[PDB]
From Swiss-Prot, chains A, B:
Outcome of swapping T86A: In CMTX1; moderate
Effect of M34V: In CMTX1; localized in the Golgi apparatus but also forming rare small gap junction-like plaques
Name of the protein described by the UniProt record: Gap junction beta-1 protein
Reported effect, M34K: In CMTX1; localized to the endoplasmic reticulum
Impact reported for I192V: In CMTX1; localized mainly on the cell membrane forming gap junction-like plaques
Outcome, altering M34T: In CMTX1; functional channel; localized in the Golgi apparatus without reaching the cell membrane
Subunit structure, as described in the record: A connexon is composed of a hexamer of connexins. Interacts with CNST.
Spans within the Cytoplasmic topological domain: 1-22
Mutation effect (E187K): In CMTX1; non-detectable levels of hemichannel activation and non-detectable levels of electrical coupling
Result when mutating V160A: In CMTX1; profoundly impaired in their ability to support the earliest stages of regeneration of myelinated fibers
Encoding gene (name): GJB1
Amino acid sequence: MNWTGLYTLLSGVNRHSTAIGRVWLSVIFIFRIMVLVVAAESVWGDEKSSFICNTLQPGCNSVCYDQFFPISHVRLWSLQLILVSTPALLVAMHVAHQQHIEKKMISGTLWWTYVISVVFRLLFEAVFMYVFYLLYPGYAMVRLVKCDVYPCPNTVDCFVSRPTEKTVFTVFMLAASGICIILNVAEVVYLIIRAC
Amino acid sequence: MNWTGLYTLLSGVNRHSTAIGRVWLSVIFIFRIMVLVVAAESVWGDEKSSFICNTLQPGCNSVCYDQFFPISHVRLWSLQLILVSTPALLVAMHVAHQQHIEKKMISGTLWWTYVISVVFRLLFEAVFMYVFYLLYPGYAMVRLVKCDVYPCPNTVDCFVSRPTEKTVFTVFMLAASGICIILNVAEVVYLIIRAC
Ligand SMILES: CC(C)CCC[C@@H](C)[C@H]1CC[C@H]2[C@@H]3CC=C4C[C@@H](O)CC[C@]4(C)[C@H]3CC[C@]12C
Ligand SMILES: CC(C)CCC[C@@H](C)[C@H]1CC[C@H]2[C@@H]3CC=C4C[C@@H](O)CC[C@]4(C)[C@H]3CC[C@]12C
């Protein structure tokens, strides 16, 4: 777990990444993973089991939970991290492949593919930010929700588990994601400026 | 239980009552009592115990039953019979009192008090008919009712016991009451005509 080994691993052995991309982006990425790990099973572990509705209708609990939580926040963030990390993984594999072929026997190609990688990383961050806004308007969760989907008769009151703690972690993850967007834009601008 | 004894009892030993008042009104009165007796404990016995609402809210069953049944049909008819029978009871007691005092020792007074008795009997019938319409619009009861009174959350579905059988007896009692109103009006008109 040598510091130089961890730095080499996270940097992806890329010769075009700048200081922000090799230090700040990696740290924020680690921060999001650690927050997600400590908050996934602990806070969102009983999201559905503890979800109850004030009714005697069989199946109203499950249908109301599905109505109000089409996809859990933890899974949404997990997908966001995987999708955001994919272009970095592709660049790392491409660099390793180039090292392999040159050992068996370019700089502009590496520069261009890195820039495209950062652009796609920024694009994925923006898309997931918009999707999160679309599914869950606002940032705070409420204790009581009004559910009227079939088979629930009329409108029933359903209660969410730990809405305040989930709100706190939602703010943390959203703030970290916003910082990643800002750093990615700065990285793109810095690369373009240095290219001239 | 001699027929002449029952006839003397029901007639009230009144010398001004006509054939309709001494035969038809008494028979319909007996009919209402018999219908009420067979339908009071059997049909309306479990009106509240069998009344259930699709909710987990404690106390919603009792509050919803009170909201939709301010007073049961059986008790409403029981009060109607007592109130309708009161002027007949007063006349019978007054006749007995006059017999008592004359034995110890008028016809116009008996005629007038009988006419007033029939008028009040008609008035009570009309008032209870209007009250029944006011509390229970229409004649048929429904299986499912929508209740939203506190503490029930939002609107809950509550289910009535034997709404069809109660509807049948409601029609019977209402029809008998309407016949009593018609006979009372006929009695008043006949007495006035014979008075001239
Ligand atoms: C600058 C930032 C974005 C760098 C992010 C680096 C991420 C994308 C890279 C760094 C090291 C990578 C890990 C290296 C090895 C493995 C083992 C494999 O069997 C599963 C994937 C896994 C666990 C990789 C997941 C992606 C990973 C964590
Ligand atoms: C022509 C129609 C309206 C006549 C109706 C007669 C009714 C009003 C009269 C006839 C005989 C009466 C009953 C005679 C005796 C008693 C015993 C008493 O301890 C309670 C009331 C009770 C049970 C009376 C109730 C009223 C009664 C039923």
